[PDB]
Symmetry: C5
């Protein structure tokens, strides 16, 4: 029994995150636990304060027409839980439900660890006989409770883009709001825990340049390579999968490449030494001692700028 008039029905909306949690990097989902606040005008149940004796009149949800607002990027039926429905005398209705749902928003991992994400929560409504359109009421959208937290993330801001998207969909108009939760990662624990030790085991690999012992060198470079793979396995949890070209993935690939050309160098130095041209051998090792750290430092700087300064 929808409200009837000469104009499209506007439904004011607001979201208020009480809790947000479980940012699943793998499934690209995150659970949320919030207030939904709908408000719209329905003159059909507008009433008299004086004859009825009360400034505001509450109703059970079965009793009156409540618009079919629905989340779009939500993986399951939401845990709907009505908290209040109250009608002002002019027929404005104010509805407030608590809800929780796991939301599906894509994450972009290219600048990880130093990435930042912008999670989305969409809301559609579909038209009936009246055209129907949603819009944001900011006093009730200021959705962050002060206690909200994503462990490992700084929660920058919770806002909504005020202009609804409206479009044809299976021969009816539909209106869609985009709420946005913006976050940036807490990278620094990674420096002690991931980047420094990989660099250490890489440096141990470079020690072989001051050795001339081919068996000491192969044992050196290849055993460090095993250590490197083992350690990569150790931190495999903090290196989420993408089809995309990640930054960290880049520097890691580059490290495998350094293990490779170090093996090539050790082999060349041993071949030259075996062919009785010790001069070229020890010149190539003595040169490598500068070359490897430097080309690394350059390749890191290029690769850093290429992802961040671009």
């Amino acid at each position: 029994p929808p409200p009837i008039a000469d104009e499209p029905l506007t439904v004011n909306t607001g979201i208020y995150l009480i809790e947000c949690y479980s940012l699943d990097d793998k499934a690209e989902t995150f659970k949320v636990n919030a207030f939904l606040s709908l408000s719209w005008k329905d003159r059909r149940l507008a009433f008299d304060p004086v004859r009825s004796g009360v400034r505001v009149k509450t109703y059970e949800p079965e009793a009156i027409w409540i618009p079919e607002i629905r989340f779009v990027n939500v993986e399951n039926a939401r845990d709907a839980d009505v908290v209040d429905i109250s009608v002002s005398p002019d027929g404005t209705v104010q509805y407030l439900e608590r809800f929780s749902a796991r939301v599906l928003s894509p994450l972009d991992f290219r600048r990880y660890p130093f990435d930042s994400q912008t999670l989305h929560i969409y809301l559609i409504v579909r038209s009936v006989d009246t055209r129907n359109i949603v819009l944001a009421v900011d006093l009730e959208k200021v959705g962050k409770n002060d206690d909200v937290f994503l462990t490992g993330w700084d929660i920058e801001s919770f806002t909504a883009v005020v202009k609804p998207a409206n479009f044809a969909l299976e021969d009816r108009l539909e209106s869609k709001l985009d709420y946005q939760l913006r976050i940036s990662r807490q990278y620094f624990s990674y420096i002690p825990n991931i980047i420094l030790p990989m660099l250490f085991i890489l440096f141990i690999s470079w020690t072989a340049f001051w050795s001339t012992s081919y068996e000491a060198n192969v044992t050196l470079v290849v055993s460090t390579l095993i250590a490197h793979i083992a350690f990569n396995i150790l931190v495999e949890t903090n290196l989420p999968k993408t089809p995309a070209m990640t930054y960290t993935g880049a520097i890691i690939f580059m490290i495998y490449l350094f293990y490779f050309v170090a093996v090539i160098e050790v082999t060349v130095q041993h071949y030259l030494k075996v062919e009785s041209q010790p001069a070229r051998a020890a010149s190539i090792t003595r040169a490598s001692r500068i070359a490897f750290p430097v080309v690394f430092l350059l390749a890191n700087i290029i690769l850093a700028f290429l992802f961040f300064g671009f």
Copy 2:
């Protein structure tokens, strides 16, 4: 209380994916979140626009006969959620539910990474006293929302094969539509991340051909073999299980075989050198230096053609 007439009842159907997600390579399932749109003629509730005063008359689902359309390859009861039921005056009924369900469709991994899949969603309906038959209405089947995504996949097309399958089943006719979601994988991140490093550790194993030191060689080939297994463990996540003969599984098996015959070679060179026939030894190593990369490049080319050009 089914509609009654002289003809089999046709039910027009349409699906509209709002979101699809969670392509679980292991379980061969994928979750989907879509519109179902049923439409069929029921003259029994056909009505007069003029006496009733309205062009279209809505009904609650309890009120009227709605056909038992059911998914076939769905792992659980679907999260049904009716959005609209409306009746046109001639008695055509148009029904629209939102639903989400994890769908079970087999995946074929033989050409992985470069595979493509064609996920299915089946729809049966079972006959009552009237014969009952489903058919696709394309204006409401054009199921992709522009925002649909499977991370790591390009979503090619969403279509339905218009001819229903109809068949006897426990002494009743049944009608079955096959909707098809076609996808191809985003392989390229694999090149930096999986194939190149395996090839590097394999090349490091081939370095042993320029060495004559048996201890340097065993340490070389066997330590690279450990590194190889470690690395295979590292990417174990991106190498899904099959009973079938995979392409990537083929090249991997072939790599183990190369580690084996390299060990055989190193051993032969050392045995020959120990038996005072250094000429045959260093001839076999000097030969290996060409043979190994080449037979590899051939064996890869054969193996590639065998899976792709066949």
Copy 3:
């Protein structure tokens, strides 16, 4: 309000697997998605075709007495979903529900990979005042849809043992049918993927018999042992846990035993060589070169016959 007469009430039953899936080797469960078809005589609602005008009369499940058929080995409340209830005029009732449940049936892993399993689905019904007994109707038990699949398994047959088990249980008779889904494993992908590489790394271990260098030998045998454990970790996914004495577990244990006695041999050859009896040393190695592969081939043949030919 149960049907009343002078005889035990027979309930005809049938199962029709639409889908089966998720054979969880760990939990020894497997999900199934099928038709249940109950049929039984109730003269109390037998009726007149002519006065009522219809050959068959449908009823909602609340309206009439439907026997409490229940699965036994099912881990949760089943997803019951009634599809049809129809009454023939003599009072025979034909009931058909779609259902899905994860079923608990033990698996026997002793001959794995080459095992075969026989999953079970039991059905009990408990007596009221009438004695109650189930029995199978084969036309509705032929439960395989042609599309049914367990990835990695050939689905041999779906049948039911026609004689019910009937027994006292807490002072009432109970009747129990046993449906049986028989399957055999798709082993062959394992040969390239598990058994050949383990054999290769074992052969690399045997290379040490042609070496006399004690450091080359320890590095050889012990580094292959690390590789072996690493590789076992790699395929740990395809080696399911049992309290029972597995065949594959046997050959694996035997491989560890071969690494051990190879270490013992290498040590003996080195001790003999150190005590100035080179003849006994090189005789023991030269002997080992035949002994190890042979005793292996024997021990595998015995072990194979012991599990399969017994």
Copy 4:
């Protein structure tokens, strides 16, 4: 509407395990699938066999007063499913529900693998105006179906301690029965699969005592130590976590300690040999050859007795 009389209301209880499954060593839970059988006297619905014409009168659960029996150590709302309620003429009521629930009972891992556990299922009931007390009826408690199984466990016995615990709780009497499922582990598969290979890799470590080559020895002892950690990783699944001092944890710790003092020994032998006192070196190695296996055998015997004979 509770039964009223001059005495505390006794409720006879019985449990009948139809299936038990999913002994989760980690969560210390286990799922169970059984009969609950309640029986109690209610004269208010006692009735006349002759005027009513029937020996026993069934009732729907809504119709009459059924005591609030509740499980204590159960992690979720139980899957309640009433099977029968029947009233004898004197007013004794016999109630029988099927149920399944995952139960939380602590496990004691100190003697693992050879441990045995005693899982619990508690039942409380809370008093109303009548005092209320539970007690066990053994004919309906004999809860094992012959088919019950916990893979990897022998199921010793299912019994209940007949004396209820009764106590004040928030100003009301409460009665609590403790049913007990006793089990002992199937250890033997562990001998081939865990303990023997660890012992082998440890013995390989002791081989170094017959070597004087320091590089051979460090490669020996340290490479076996890597193998040991790898293998411990391989069986990490069968070594469940505790805050408590496990037996298997003890022997494992002791093994690490043996790797350590073997490294210390190899180092001392090399230091003595380097300081031109070969006599003390080879005396210490020759002594170690006996000492290590022996102190191990003693330390294992002490440790075994300390956990089992204590």
Copy 5:
């Protein structure tokens, strides 16, 4: 139909943990299974003991007004299960439900293993036309059953902070109680299982200081480094992820740093020895033998005090 009077409505509350379980270090959640006890005055259903004949009058939850108390930090709809509602003659109502819910409370890992946590359970209630305020009744808050246990934790105390938080929220007053479950970890099993073996493999690394053999030394230090990473992988389960600067993470990082500077030392000793200044080489090794254990002991002491004494 809320109670009406001149004062804000107080609702007395109490929680009684029957069981608590599943402390998930990763998700920072923990399941709980408890009593909720609400009590509040409603004169509208106050009644006469003498005319009605009973001291206390029970009601079904549908019958009367029960306040919307709701958990805040709970991840799903709670498994509500009403046990009793009883009304005293003056109109005080006493309500008691059993419930279970997984609770979301952050954990602080900085002092792990030796950490202690303080889990929270919040309770809000939102105002209607009457102002509404919660407060704790201690006789019914004493929530620990004697049997409660978190394996690996000592359960210190269960209490509630008696002063409610009250605040504006979307134009209504809200009241919020904070129950607190305090716990401290059972660390000691970690000493045999994690810290001692890491220290052992580190000491093995220090053995290299008494060796002058560069190949023995590289094999020593780098192979212990592989062992260290392997072992870290082995205990990866007991080292939970944080964005924060953990203590155990600190000592682990410091251990990687010791492997690094030990490699640097071994390299320096070999370079000095190669440049014909053996005096400086063996002086640096002989110095290292004291330096490494000492700086370690200091750095551990500083690090310990920095986390604990600060």
